[PDB]
Every structure is written in C-alpha cells, then in structure tokens.
Design a protein around this nucleic acid. Sequence first.
DNA 1: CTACCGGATTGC
DNA 2: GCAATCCGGTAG
Length: 210
Amino acid sequence: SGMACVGRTTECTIVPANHFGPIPGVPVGTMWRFRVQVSESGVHRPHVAGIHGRSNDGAYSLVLAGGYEDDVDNGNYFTYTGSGGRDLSGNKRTAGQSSDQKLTNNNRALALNCHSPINEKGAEAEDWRQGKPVRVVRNMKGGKHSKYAPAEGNRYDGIYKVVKYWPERGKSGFLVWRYLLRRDDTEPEPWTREGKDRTRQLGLTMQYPE
DNA sequence: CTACCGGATTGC
DNA sequence: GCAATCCGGTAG
C-alpha cells in the first residue's frame, strides 16, 4: 500500500488548524513529495481534498492537482473549480462530474474569502486584496495542462485571494462553481527566474517521508 | 486502463 | 458523538 493508506507522523502545532495566511517557517518554494507531508507541515491539512475550509469561516488553503478539468492555471492567477458534483459511491475519492455543484461546504468556504457578501449567484470583490488569504499548493498532476506545476510532488506557491466566483456549466455539461484566484505575495513565484534563484539561495529541496 | 482502501477533517 | 466528504495513491 505504500503511501495510499498512511496517516500523519506529526501535526502542525506552530499555528492552529484554522490559521489564515502563511505558515511560519514554511517559505514559498517549499516542496514535499506526498500530500501527507504537506498536511504535516500545516500548509494544506486535508490529505485528499483540494480545499481546506470551514463553510462559516473561510478557506485556508487549496491544491491545484489537475483533478478537475474546469481548472485553468495561469500562474499569477488561476480559475479554480469547486468540489463535488460527483458520485463517489463505492468508497471513491474521485470521479467525473455527474450532477451540479453546490455552494456548500468547501465551496462556500472558498467563496467567503472573496471580499464581498456571500451570494448564491456569485460575487465580485471591489477591493480584492482585502479578501482572506488562501495558501496555494501546486501538485505535479496539474502538469498535464499547466506549465506552472512542479515536475514532481507538491510545492507551496504563496498567498492568493479570491477576486470573484460564479456558477457556470462545466466541460462535462453540469454546473460547476468557479473561482478566480490572484496572487498577493511578496515572495517570488517559484517558476520565475527570481523564484528559481530564491529557492536555490534558501537551499530548498524536496522533502520525502522519514 | 479500472477499483477502492486509511485517515483527517468538517458537517450535522 | 456519528455521518459525510474527499484535486490520493496504489495494485492488478
């Protein structure tokens, strides 16, 4: 079973589970081979889910991992897809779209980060930088369609904010919730010349399980 | 390609 | 507390 059914070896105690913003001691460019490690770091606590959020508070983090065809990654911004609209019966974790997504649970959480009152028809923020921060991790499985994904594993790419969100018919013909995320982070983007230099100057290397 | 498990977390 | 959810990971 390797890493398929494993739990954490430690938990992040440096900040609590509902911390908004960067995790202390984890710079942009930090890299981990497996999602469980990303969880142990505090950067993205769920081992499987794309969004970490509480539907009455906000979303703390998300992962771009190519798991949702409606995702569109443009590096310094991206269009993210809500979760759900899927039949996971039979103890699945992933499936194709087979019903309309809903503005509930993780999807409502991420909408709350937008600097606009929550709205079932979607919203746009007049001052997007006042929104709640989202920690963004890119996983190599996004690399099928995105040149910004890391070659392997998972990489912390910094703080993004939700500019707007809206419902739209997805590629599979069912409604999906879509979110425009835009970067708001003083640290360089890992894929740029400056980001590559920073990663090197910091001595960051891929973290593997102990 | 197909099938489906633990664990972590939030929903209720 | 128990139910629901799930952008992972592996075996066949």
